[PDB]
Amino acid sequence: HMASKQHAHILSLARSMIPPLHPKLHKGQAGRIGVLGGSGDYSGAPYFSSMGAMRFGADLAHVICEPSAGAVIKTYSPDLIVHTILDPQKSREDIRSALKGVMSRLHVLIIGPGLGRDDHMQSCAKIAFELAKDMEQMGVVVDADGLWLVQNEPKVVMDWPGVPRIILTPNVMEFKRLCDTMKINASGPHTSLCPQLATALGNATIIQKGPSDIISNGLKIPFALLESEEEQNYLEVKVEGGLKRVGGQGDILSGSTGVLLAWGSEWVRGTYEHVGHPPPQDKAIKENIPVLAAYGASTFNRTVSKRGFQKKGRSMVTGDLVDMVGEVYEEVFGNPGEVEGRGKL
């Protein structure tokens, strides 16, 4: 009842972020997404995140990685632009300037897929956090060992200028580690842990992944989204996912999260006004693009896993899901948005 209406309503708000597929748009206005990771042996995760982003709808996806992983990742798909610029044989200044060059061409950077924990790649991720901080129109999604960096240096996400534009996606153990760093007591009510952590991290948006996902930026969900009672300060996605717990499904999530974050950010900026999607009136929607991107992506990713599991069952691997992103996008966003009168979504 209430839960179904609220879920549909918030999903509808997420759908409102999506630019129409319109003759007047040119290459790049539907999203330029970067994935920073791919160290050493970790080839699959940055592919899943970046190719997931392309199948979800990005015009361009960039992978920023080390040379060895980069050579593998390029063979998976000619549609990815793979920058092997995190070469430990390069000076730090050269890496910083190479990273700045690529990042200046991005709406959103996903930090973490296949990043690993060694000093070099962690330092490269820290550089990227620092550049993103000072690029006010840059969104950031943090996953995998990107979250290890936050756990070690939480200030990398704290006190950013501009609108809020960070989404963290910890699994159960990554979340517990984050809470321990921020001295958040685990005896708290289960649904209060995520808003506490988000608050302690300067109201970044956090997707706490699990049997259900708990989403929060630490603030109450404004009237535009969620009587005499205050609106909840978290959202819980319980939509049916898949039953096969094969590795990589969080990378589909980060890639699709990054795309929705880029679209919603460009939407609020006014980029889609000339194709009939002007920014929203309500300041609360502008301030909550990360929560809407997060809620939409969480919902979508479980639906992708559900459909992949219906097709493949016990045999499902995450590579299968990359091929199903398009049809599930059409189910969740494209066909509903078009029937809603939003244009070809």
Next chain:
Amino acid sequence: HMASKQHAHILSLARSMIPPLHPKLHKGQAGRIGVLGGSGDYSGAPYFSSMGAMRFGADLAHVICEPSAGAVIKTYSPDLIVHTILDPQKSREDIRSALKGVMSRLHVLIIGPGLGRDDHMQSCAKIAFELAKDMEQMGVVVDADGLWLVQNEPKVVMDWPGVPRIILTPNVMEFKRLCDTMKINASGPHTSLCPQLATALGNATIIQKGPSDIISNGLKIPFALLESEEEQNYLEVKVEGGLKRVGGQGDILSGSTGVLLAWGSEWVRGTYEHVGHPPPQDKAIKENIPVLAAYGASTFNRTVSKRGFQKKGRSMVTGDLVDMVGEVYEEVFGNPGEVEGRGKL
């Protein structure tokens, strides 16, 4: 009305360039196409152009690139011949002679896909421009950073011997940069900019890519193609394309442009006379092979993007389009040409 009749007529002339698939032809007479590019990290664009060329109908497609990109590009397809001869550890003379060896086996060289802007690859492209200039039966298609070289040294396309045989394919910004180099005033009428630039570049044929494509070699479109009024000096392709602005669709265009340029050039040379396609009577058609190849490829590429977008929608990537070149070729050229009595096209 008039626009539909003219479009169909010019497309019919482009179709007349296509050799029949005939038992008497042997390997290579339906096109030996080269793509010069593939530097550093840029793996996808030369694949899209060269594999697009093969799916369009070339007998052999060659990629001329650096070793690192070449190793990736080879894994995409055993049908491409990848020459990793642009090795910066090789002497210039060795590169020149290696390039000359491969180019002497080509009808057409596509310069630019994944070329990049660094001194080495730009110098390799300049060598290739110089050899092509002095190989009178060699056609050239210039895209991507091949156009950066022209923008820096426009003489590389000026004063070529033989028939005109160069086609440039700038997008909106590349076109503006070219106009600035050639001191062409942007206040001019919109459809007069492309013929002015082509004229300033010695009547090379230019595809100005955009919401529609404007095609011109700077000269009026002769009576064979376009009362008391002079024929237009440009053609405009407005056929429906796709709505997904994913990167790489200009590489499908360059590969298909290169194939049509090779076929039309061999056709005028007399190569297909013994299989029932003698050269055209009209000198204007011979002088306008580049415009016909350009018009046919522009039309075809938007139709490919249209069909790929109908199948994949928001999820379309350019890799999907490579697989659809064959069926769209059959729609645009093969089945119409056969019903026209041109043989199995």
